[PDB]
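Inputs:
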Amino acid sequence: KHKILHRLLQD
Amino acid sequence: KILHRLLQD
Amino acid sequence: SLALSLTADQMVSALLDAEPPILYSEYDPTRPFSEASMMGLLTNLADRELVHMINWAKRVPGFVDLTLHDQVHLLECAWLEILMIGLVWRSMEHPGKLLFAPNLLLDRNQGKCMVEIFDMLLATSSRFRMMNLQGEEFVCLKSIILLNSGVYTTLKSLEEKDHIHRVLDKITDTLIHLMAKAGLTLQQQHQRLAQLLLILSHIRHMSNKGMEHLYSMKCKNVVPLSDLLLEMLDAHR
Amino acid sequence: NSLALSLTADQMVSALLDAEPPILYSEYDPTRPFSEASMMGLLTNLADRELVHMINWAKRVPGFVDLTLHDQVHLLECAWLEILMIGLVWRSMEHPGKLLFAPNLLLDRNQGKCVEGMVEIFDMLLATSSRFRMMNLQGEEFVCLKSIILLNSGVYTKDHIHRVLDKITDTLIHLMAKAGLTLQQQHQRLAQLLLILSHIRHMSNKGMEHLYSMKCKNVVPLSDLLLEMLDAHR
Ligand SMILES: Oc1ccc(C(=C2Cc3ccccc3C2)c2ccc(O)cc2)cc1
Ligand SMILES: Oc1ccc(C(=C2Cc3ccccc3C2)c2ccc(O)cc2)cc1
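Outputs:
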């Protein structure tokens, strides 16, 4: 599903 | 309206 | 104006005595279930509950000091929230199930298409159970929903909201009085007060989602809504 | 064990004030939007940039990074429009009858009429801002409320979050006692503040339907990030 939020929350 | 007259009842 | 002169104990007694009865549905376990009759059972049930809810509201201290136009607005905004918190309170001692009526327990497996709203109601119920919510606290929360949910939607219609805010403050005082009499320390009283009022945010959320599902059920033209429910639903255009 | 529960009340206030996102600007073109396409274009662009600051703001809310990545995603997906709206209401506080979306973008309800369904949410935001102004809401209180929204709007969608939520309650009471309020005034104001969070939830639900309708209209281009934030609400 790979959300943009997943990436942005890591940094 | 139904609610109006039930309230003033 | 009686409401503003009532003591905390008189406020609790006034709310408890005004409690609506718990109604039965027309459910028949022998009758085969479906996806239209079950919502038909809930629709018929909500419609009869609304008649008691209206009479309950007129016994809520301060409600009848409002004009008829404001009483209509508050009920039109809060009716589904009030039904839902009644359902959640009714279901406290039935974990994993919603007690719509003494003869109608439903778990998540029934309830078909609706399951998201069902889970939210189940979570609020276990939340009340974890907090050990008392009946004196519940009747306060339910009266808060009635006065607050539509308070932020002329000429001197500002003095009407000032009366509502003062009565709301009176209910907050009554809530603190209940917790202090239960032995809660001052920090516990404030924390529990916050916890209870935060649940009201979730109750509003479930009502907004219920209104959308009911609007969809109407446009599907399958489940017939009653004349009052149609008008109550129409208020949330 | 979380570092968030070991903070004092002052440390909690300082951490939240230091995490505050900045106030962003809209486009510097000075035409007042009266089109739905021009108005929703500026608001969507604004909100898209604000979301990037919100994500990094939330990571600095005490207790938030103790959650799993999935839990962080879920809370932000549920709360993002509530957080944008309470921020809008906050900075519109000193502009009665006006919404300050940006320092160079103040909209009145006469412009909200240019989009079907917008003026209704416009008036609710206006009434909320007027409520904050009449209560003399302080910045230290605002950031406590904004954090509560982030943590509470998606809890039951848990022991850790409720402990952090209790911590913020102590912090709110700490600010009111510090401001000289009596014991009775403290719990009454606490209730008045938290009951507004019910209306903030209501406005977000109505706003989310308005953005879903705008998506189906397909005239306003939505970013992939706003699209996934919007799609999360089913
Ligand atoms: O026409 C209707 C109006 C209200 C309802 C009630 C709902 C409760 C509920 C639960 C899951 C999904 C939808 C709904 C709506 C509901 C019914 C009774 C009650 O005491 C509380 C809520 C259902 C049909
Ligand atoms: O793509 C968008 C995402 C969010 C918005 C914001 C809304 C605020 C608002 C007010 C009335 C009707 C709809 C909406 C949405 C909004 C924008 C900025 C902000 O600071 C707060 C809310 C608008 C477009």
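Remarks. The pocket of 7FJ (ligand 2) is lined by residues D 40, 43-44, 46-47, 50, 84-85, 87-88, 101, 118, 121-122, 207, 210-211, 226 (CB under 6 Å). The longest strand of chain D covers residues 99-102.
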